[PDB]
Ligand binder design. Structure first.
Ligand SMILES: [Mg+2]
Ligand SMILES: [Mg+2]
Ligand SMILES: [Mg+2]
Ligand SMILES: [Mg+2]
Ligand SMILES: [Mg+2]
Ligand SMILES: [Mg+2]
Ligand SMILES: [Mg+2]
Ligand SMILES: [Mg+2]
Ligand SMILES: [Mg+2]
Ligand SMILES: [Mg+2]
Ligand SMILES: [Mg+2]
Ligand SMILES: [Mg+2]
Ligand SMILES: [Mg+2]
Ligand SMILES: [Mg+2]
Ligand SMILES: [Mg+2]
Ligand SMILES: [Mg+2]
Lengths: 65, 271, 100, 88, 70, 116
RNA sequence: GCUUGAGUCUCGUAGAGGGGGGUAGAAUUCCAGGUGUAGCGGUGAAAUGCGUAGAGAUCUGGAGGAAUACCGGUGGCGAAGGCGGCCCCCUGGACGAAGACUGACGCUCAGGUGCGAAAGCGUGGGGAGCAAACAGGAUUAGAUACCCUGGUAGUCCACGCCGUAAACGAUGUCGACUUGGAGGUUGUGCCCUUGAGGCGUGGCUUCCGGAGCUAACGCGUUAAGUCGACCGCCUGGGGAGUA
């Protein structure tokens, strides 16, 4: 649950998509922090990074484009 | 800016002036001036053909460069001047070889700025280049209608033309009236938007303020007699007629366009 | 002096046009005493959604340090270029050499 | 925001020591250097009603400091307002 | 909520997996929510009212944990 | 005619009706049948059974084209969201895949005002 | 004179704090077409409305305006009003650790000045959706309402005006003191981060309760407890926040 991003403290980067694809649903929606367990600080950086990879077409806005 | 004249007289109560301190205060450029005699509406036969014209102040025509067919040779703006023959201010322009010219002044042009024309020019206000090279969705002015003709559309104060789309050899423009019109793609178009955008907000305030621009009084057809105007007649403000022009044709609704030769270019009429 | 993270995508049919323009845009940074730190080129990628059709593009990453004004006349050449799509100029600092 | 290099000039120039920040002359000289730098921001962004509250606090705090300096001594106050250029 | 039917499969297995995908995506909740305009002052009140229930009802079962009923 | 082999079924489920349209993979419509036109006028066309009959009639009227595979593209809420797909299998078609298409704005236009 | 109030400087942290400019995707509506048939829409039920001039559905192309799903949280920022896509430019406040510096420079504040939701006003633009007024269809004893089909101002932008709200924790600002518990968010110090760890220390915030206070309900270290400084206001209901 709470584990990832708290050990090996790092700032969520929008470039690496493998880490980002873990935190989205089957339709490109960001997964709530209640489910994954990411801390409230790193969810804000995480969400802001997913909204940045979508702009560059690295990630889908929705599964129906 | 617009300044409201204080009511020191009935005729100054309602005046609103548009004053531009950036304008030239001295005399115009002598070599680019001409003689401009008036007519009063009268054609060859000496008979008035446009009514409500006559009188007014004397004006001298300034030869404004519309073609803008001097490619290369960057030009520096010398000063801004007041053109009485037009609704927008003009700009004196000095080219790097020594030739001076008059141009329609875009809305963001001050003395000292640099312009130039041709396919190599940059996308900046005041620059003229063929609409092949101008990005779609841009706002241009002084558009042409035929390659090399000189420039007819978007010429008054504050008017502009959007380039909606480009389809091969033609460009669709959303004219200021709401029309969508196709023009050739080699027609030049000065990039930017014409200046003097406050020209709307001026109010004359009195009858002489319109008389001294050459606008003679307009008489209504109801005050006429049944022989001078189809409305005419009456004993105490009677109308009972469908409103018409003084020559019988029905004003107030009836369309009059009939060309059939330039209908290929009108994509969508006004609204 | 300010640090930026320019990432721009070129047309899929200008893949031979990027390797010439990448140094031309870089030369403007170095001409004004601005340095460049990490210039990875991601090659040709696949878009998650179409961008005016074009299910493929060409990604570049510059990550330069330049005066605040120099990036201003680099943004416009991205804007008026018909072959550069979805330029994004962030404002990072420090780090380099990751993600590929 | 009165960057680090610019705030070190005023402290050294108006200070009685190399590291003497906080002296009434230095504090007023620092506040004036920001009120003057903000007159170009508010000539363009006239609608910044939120940043203007911060500006109107440095104005009202530099006047509170000038009053203290004048009451404490006048040989140092008259030199400071003349050196800076203010009180009209 | 796209669901692709695999190979060597029944149908009623697939249709049940379609509902599960749709229920997980909250499609019908979003459609029902966006039918009419909820005023901002009723959207904020409906959120604090439902969080007050979430807190009390969790503390209500705690006070009922340390009792014998018979 | 034209003997189309692969088609697409477009179920426009709603709170008040259900329109089933079978199109080819390029969007052209081959035939349609609704729930309210099936003799279910009134408060009976909302019911999921009335939408089942629509799937039966829309399975007909494309007999000539001879479709053998269908992709189901459900849209909107409503009772005829489930009972229509299964009637497109009980009618003899093959459901290659099922995709849910539905207009969900990212907070776009303002919806109508609340009913009282 | 002094540094325990107040403030300045060095280093970082978090944030829908503000103003300006661009850009992305989903969706509604409209326009031009292809396929395609007799219904669509709506309701408690209907009708008005749209459709054989071919609607509704479905696919392609385009133009426009507004708002930013998920993240999202009795979460955060702001003096209050309030602030939610992403990026850049200009900019205000807060907080924390270790130091250095000024040496009472402080608290409150009548008149005064400024900011102040929504509606509304003026000039010029814009206008997708929604929708006062308005029209029609129903319900009804009646229904100049709720319900349905449409729909103008307005909602949007620039600049001015208005200056009021159940503008509300119905609780003025500042300072000190007075048992506890479980949480949220944001810094920081020490040690076995040696392993999803342990102990302290600050800022802001939600809940429950002790003494006490209160007419009671209830507040309860963020007091409505115990005190000090300054300001605003109250003096039976109606007439009346009216002349
Ligand atoms: Mg007249
Ligand atoms: Mg007469
Ligand atoms: Mg006659
Ligand atoms: Mg009479
Ligand atoms: Mg009569
Ligand atoms: Mg409705
Ligand atoms: Mg005060
Ligand atoms: Mg007062
Ligand atoms: Mg308003
Ligand atoms: Mg208005
Ligand atoms: Mg108006
Ligand atoms: Mg009041
Ligand atoms: Mg409020
Ligand atoms: Mg009150
Ligand atoms: Mg309590
Ligand atoms: Mg009154």
């Amino acid at each position: 649950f709470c584990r990832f991003t708290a050990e090996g403290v790092q700032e969520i980067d929008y470039k690496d998509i493998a880490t980002l694809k873990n935190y989205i649903t089957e339709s490109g929606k960001i997964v709530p922090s209640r489910i994954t367990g990411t801390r409230a600080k790193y969810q804000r950086q995480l969400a802001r990074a997913i909204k940045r990879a979508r702009y560059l077409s690295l990630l889908p806005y929705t599964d129906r484009h | 800016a617009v300044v409201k004249c204080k009511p020191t007289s009935p005729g100054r109560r309602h005046v609103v002036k548009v004053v531009n301190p950036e304008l030239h205060k001295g005399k115009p450029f002598a070599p680019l001036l001409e003689k401009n005699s008036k007519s009063g509406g009268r054609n060859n036969n000496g008979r008035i053909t446009t009514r409500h014209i006559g009188g007014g102040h004397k004006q001298a025509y300034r030869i404004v460069d519309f073609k803008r067919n001097k490619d290369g040779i960057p030009a520096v703006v010398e000063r801004l001047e007041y053109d009485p023959n037009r609704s927008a201010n003009i700009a004196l322009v000095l080219y790097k070889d020594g030739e001076r010219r008059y141009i329609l002044a875009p809305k963001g042009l001050k003395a000292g700025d640099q312009i130039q024309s041709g396919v190599d020019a940059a996308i900046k206000p005041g620059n003229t280049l063929p609409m092949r090279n101008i990005p779609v969705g841009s706002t241009v002015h002084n558009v042409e209608m035929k390659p090399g003709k000189g420039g007819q559309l978007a010429r008054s104060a504050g008017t502009y033309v959007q380039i909606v789309a480009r389809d091969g050899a033609y460009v669709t423009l959303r004219l200021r009236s709401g029309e969508m019109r196709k023009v050739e793609a080699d027609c030049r178009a000065t990039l930017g938007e014409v200046g003097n955008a406050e020209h709307m907000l001026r109010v004359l305030g009195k009858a002489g303020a319109a008389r001294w621009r050459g606008v003679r009084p307009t008489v209504r057809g109801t005050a006429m007699n049944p022989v001078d105007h189809p409305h005419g007649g009456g004993e105490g403000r009677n109308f009972g007629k469908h409103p018409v022009t003084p020559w019988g044709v029905q004003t107030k609704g009836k369309k009059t366009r009939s060309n059939k030769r330039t209908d290929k270019f009108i994509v969508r009429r006004r609204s | 002096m300010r640090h930026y993270e320019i990432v721009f995508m070129v047309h899929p049919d200008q893949s031979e046009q990027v390797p010439g323009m990448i140094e031309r845009y870089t030369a403007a940074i170095t001409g004004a005493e601005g340095k460049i730190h990490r210039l990875e080129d991601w090659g040709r990628r696949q878009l998650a959604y179409p961008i005016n059709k074009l299910h493929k593009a060409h990604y570049v990453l510059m990550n330069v340090e330049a005066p605040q004004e120099v990036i201003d006349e680099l943004e416009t050449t991205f804007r008026f270029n018909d072959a550069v799509i979805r330029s994004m100029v962030m404002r990072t600092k420090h780090a380099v050499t990751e993600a590929s | 925001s009165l960057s680090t290099e610019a705030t070190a000039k005023i402290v050294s120039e108006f200070g009685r020591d190399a590291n003497d920040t906080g002296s009434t002359e230095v504090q007023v000289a620092l506040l004036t250097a920001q009120i003057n730098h903000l007159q170009g921001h508010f000539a363009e962004h006239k609608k910044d009603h939120h940043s203007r509250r911060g500006l109107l606090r440095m104005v009202s705090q530099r006047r509170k400091l000038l009053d203290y300096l004048k009451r404490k001594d006048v040989a140092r106050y008259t030199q400071l307002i003349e050196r800076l250029g203010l009180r009209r | 909520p796209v669901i692709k039917v695999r190979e060597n499969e029944p149908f009623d297995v697939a249709l049940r997996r379609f509902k599960r995908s749709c229920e997980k995506a909250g499609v019908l909740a979003e459609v029902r929510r966006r039918e009419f305009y909820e005023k901002p002052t009723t959207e904020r009140k409906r959120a604090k009212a439902s969080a007050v229930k979430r807190h009390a009802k969790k503390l209500a079962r705690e006070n009922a944990r340390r009792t014998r009923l018979y | 005619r034209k003997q189309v082999s692969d088609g697409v079924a477009h179920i426009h489920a709603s709170f008040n009706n259900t329109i089933v349209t079978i199109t080819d993979r390029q969007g052209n419509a081959l035939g349609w049948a609704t729930a309210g036109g099936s003799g279910f006028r009134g408060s009976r066309k909302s019911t999921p059974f009335a939408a089942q009959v629509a799937a039966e009639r829309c399975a007909d009227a494309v007999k000539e084209y001879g479709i053998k595979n269908l992709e189901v593209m459900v849209k909107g809420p409503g009772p005829g969201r489930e009972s229509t797909i299964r009637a497109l299998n009980a009618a003899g078609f093959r459901i290659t895949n099922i995709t849910d298409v539905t207009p969900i704005p990212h907070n776009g236009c303002r919806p109508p005002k609340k009913r009282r």
